Amino acid sequence: AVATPEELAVNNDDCAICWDSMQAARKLPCGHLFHNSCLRSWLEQDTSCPTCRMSLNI
């Protein structure tokens, strides 16, 4: 569920959760770029901001 182009990922090749870099890159309502697998996995585990520690209302 990524609406951003791979261009963004290339420009920002670095994960905050799973670390490293890949391709898929989605943006959270808080202001963070997470991969499809990294995010999805996060949403399945917890719906909280890894950094902001704030719950996403969307």
List residues near Zn ion by CB under 5 A: 15, 18, 30, 32, 35, 38, 49, 51-52
Minimal CB distance residue for Zn ion: 15
Q: Which tokens sit at 55? A: 């719950």
Query: Which is nearer to Zn ion, 11 or 51 (by Cβ)?
Result: 51
Shortest approach of Zn ion to residue 11 CB, angstroms?
Answer: 15
User: How many CB atoms sit inside 10 A of residue 15's CB?
Assistant: 18
Shortest approach of Zn ion to residue 58 CB, angstroms?
Answer: 13
Alpha-carbon span 23 to 51, nearest angstrom? 21
Residue with tokens 């399945």, as numbered in its chain? 44
